[PDB]
Amino acid sequence: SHMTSATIPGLDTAPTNHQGLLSWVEEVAELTQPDRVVFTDGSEEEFQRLCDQLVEAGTFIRLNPEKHKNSYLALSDPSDVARVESRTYICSAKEIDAGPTNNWMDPGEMRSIMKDLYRGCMRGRTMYVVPFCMGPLGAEDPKLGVEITDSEYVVVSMRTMTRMGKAALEKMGDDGFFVKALHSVGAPLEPGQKDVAWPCSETKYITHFPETREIWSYGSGYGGNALLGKKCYSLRIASAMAHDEGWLAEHMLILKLISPENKAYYFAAAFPSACGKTNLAMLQPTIPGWRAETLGDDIAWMRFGKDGRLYAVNPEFGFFGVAPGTNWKSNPNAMRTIAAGNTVFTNVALTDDGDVWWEGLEGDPQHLIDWKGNDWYFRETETNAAHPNSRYCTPMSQCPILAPEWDDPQGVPISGILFGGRRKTTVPLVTEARDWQHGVFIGATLGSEQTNVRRDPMAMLPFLGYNVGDYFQHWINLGKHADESKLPKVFFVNWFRRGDDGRFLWPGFGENSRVLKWIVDRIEHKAGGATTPIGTVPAVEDLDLDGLDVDAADVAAALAVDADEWRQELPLIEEWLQFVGEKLPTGVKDEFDALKERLG
Numbered sequence: 348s349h350m351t352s353a354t355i356p357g358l359d360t361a362p363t364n365h366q367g368l369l370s371w372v373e374e375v376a377e378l379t380q381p382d383r384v385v386f387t388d389g390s391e392e393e394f395q396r397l398c399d400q401l402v403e404a405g406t407f408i409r410l411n412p413e414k415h416k417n418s419y420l421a422l423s424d425p426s427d428v429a430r431v432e433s434r435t436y437i438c439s440a441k442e443i444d445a446g447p448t449n450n451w452m453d454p455g456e457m458r459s460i461m462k463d464l465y466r467g468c469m470r471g472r473t474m475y476v477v478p479f480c481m482g483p484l485g486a487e488d489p490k491l492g493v494e495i496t497d498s499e500y501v502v503v504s505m506r507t508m509t510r511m512g513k514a515a516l517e518k519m520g521d522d523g524f525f526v527k528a529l530h531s532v533g534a535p536l537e538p539g540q541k542d543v544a545w546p547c548s549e550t551k552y553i554t555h556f557p558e559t560r561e562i563w564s565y566g567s568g569y570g571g572n573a574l575l576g577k578k579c580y581s582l583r584i585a586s587a588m589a590h591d592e593g594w595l596a597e598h599m600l601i602l603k604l605i606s607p608e609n610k611a612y613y614f615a616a617a618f619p620s621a622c623g624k625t626n627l628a629m630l631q632p633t634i635p636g637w638r639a640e641t642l643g644d645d646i647a648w649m650r651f652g653k654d655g656r657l658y659a660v661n662p663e664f665g666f667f668g669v670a671p672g673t674n675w676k677s678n679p680n681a682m683r684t685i686a687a688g689n690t691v692f693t694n695v696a697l698t699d700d701g702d703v704w705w706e707g708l709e710g711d712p713q714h715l716i717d718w719k720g721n722d723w724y725f726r727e728t729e730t731n732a733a734h735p736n737s738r739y740c741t742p743m744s745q746c747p748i749l750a751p752e753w754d755d756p757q758g759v760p761i762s763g764i765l766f767g768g769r770r771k772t773t774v775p776l777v778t779e780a781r782d783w784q785h786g787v788f789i790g791a792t793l794g795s796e797q798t799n800v801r802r803d804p805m806a807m808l809p810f811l812g813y814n815v816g817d818y819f820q821h822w823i824n825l826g827k828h829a830d831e832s833k834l835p836k837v838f839f840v841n842w843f844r845r846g847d848d849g850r851f852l853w854p855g856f857g858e859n860s861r862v863l864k865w866i867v868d869r870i871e872h873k874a875g876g877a878t879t880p881i882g883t884v885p886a887v888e889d890l891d892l893d894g895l896d897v898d899a900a901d902v903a904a905a906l907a908v909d910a911d912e913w914r915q916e917l918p919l920i921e922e923w924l925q926f927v928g929e930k931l932p933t934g935v936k937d938e939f940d941a942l943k944e945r946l947g
């Protein structure tokens with residue numbers, strides 16, 4: 348019954364222009380034994396054809412097209428609802444090159460395990476070969492990839508999340524380099540066996556081979572485990588490429604801010620989860636003459652331009668956002684982006700009229716079908732209607748505040764890099780670094796609340812493709828070798844400081860634009876602030892609070908730098924620097940010592 352690649356349907360009509368790609372596909376098909384092989388072109392006719400099959404399989408239902416055109420709901424296996432960090436591996440030749448923030452396994456050992464798993468794993472399934480490009484196609488060094496997958500759901504979501512299909516394939520030419528990404532849901536089928544809507548396995552691996560730029564995923568059909576352009580490529584593999592090639596692959600939103608003089612400023616901002624990252628990416632300023640547009644709300648690739656400034660591009664093509672908490676009152680621009688349709692929703696609730704709902708959304712629906720397919724009742728049912736990690740997957744081009752520069756292969760010049768977290772105490776609303784190296788330290792020691800303070804350096808803690816210490820050195824290196832005058836200024840922001848009684852000292856949301864105005868003014872040297880031990884921090888009088896009904900004392904408290912509180916912060920930072928291990932750069936330790944000295 349086992350078939351040689353050549354006789355597997357689809358391989359006789361495969362594109363032969365790129366032999367390297369073709370040989371790889373043949374090798375994989377020989378191993379996984381799919382029923383047939385399909386090379387995807389990303390066209391509209393293909394998209395609708397795959398969606399018809401997804402509806403037929405029960406993987407998708409078609410949502411009411413009067414409310415969301417060309418849109419679908421998928422409900423997953425309850426065992427397969429999120430990225431699985433404990434099953435995610437960086438398989439560098441040496442363990443030190445994965446480092447303490449990463450899960451390592453010897454690559455020989457990993458390949459033996461996974462090749463065994465892949466054997467026969469696609470029986471009874473179509474094997475898709477999915478070409479894609481990360482970033483605009485017109486780039487100087489376009490970062491290409493091919494994902495092989497046995498998941499039709501994956502193909503469709505990749506079409507939205509990346510520039511998928513024909514254009515990318517042509518960009519590969521006859522022998523062009525591309526990232527080899529391999530994926531299987533790990534659920535082979537017997538002839539005539541009825542499938543389930545969401546196949547998956549109990550056994551999962553999401554594995555990265557940094558030297559060869561390869562990604563192997565098995566067992567999950569969900570999000571970042573399976574859509575391999577998203578975290579696996581754009582952050583983990585890309586950070587390794589960036590390390591070797593002199594640029595930066597970062598977990599940052601890209602925001603365009605326009606002042607009343609009609610000048611544009613671009614910011615790249617890194618936050619961990621639960622810090623309102625998406626609300627900031629789609630900010631609506633609350634002060635006259637200030638406007639904001641987005642270029643991305645997740646990943647940013649930054650590369651020095653010929654003028655010596657840092658330029659950012661969004662390598663992605665779609666949004667893959669957490670649905671619960673998204674609503675009209677707090678993020679109408681996200682709602683409007685979704686309202687335009689062409690969206691795949693996963694694990695949200697279904698309204699009686701074929702619309703969608705999730706916790707946080709307006710409407711107080713009286714009855715819903717929940718993410719498990721069960722009846723749900725308002726102010727009664729004690730379980731969430733939508734899964735807390737449920738998602739919308741929607742084209743970026745539908746965003747009403749999308750910046751026109753979003754598809755420019757040259758990217759946009761970054762004036763400021765922001766780092767942020769949630770801190771009840773200690774860390775002020777906004778701080779500016781003293782210089783680049785201090786900036787690196789501020790990013791490297793980014794703390795955010797946990798059940799107590801978690802360190803999430805540059806918000807890359809679960810996404811680094813190599814040793815965290817070498818990563819810090821890489822940041823130091825790029826700044827050291829640059830024109831200092833053209834480097835982005837670095838800021839840390841804490842929207843979430845609290846009074847002793849638990850009040851929020853800063854109202855946040857749209858009012859965050861007032862802090863961004865200060866940042867712009869600092870960049871233009873039009874604003875002051877206090878020199879504190881931790882950097883430049885504005886006083887209340889440095890901020891535009893006009894029109895804002897807020898207690899000035901609360902804002903003052905939000906901005907306070909208390910030496911005693913910061914002395915308490917020191918040993919937390921120290922233990923983190925120790926955890927970073929033998930590769931911790933002296934330049935980062937230097938900044939710790941300078942801080943400790945300034946505090947006295």
Ligand SMILES: O=C([O-])C(=O)[O-]
Pocket residue numbers: 620645
């Ligand atoms: O889902 C995501 O984008 C994450 O966890 O950062």
Ligand SMILES: [Mn+2]
Pocket residue numbers: 598645
């Ligand atoms: Mn993210």
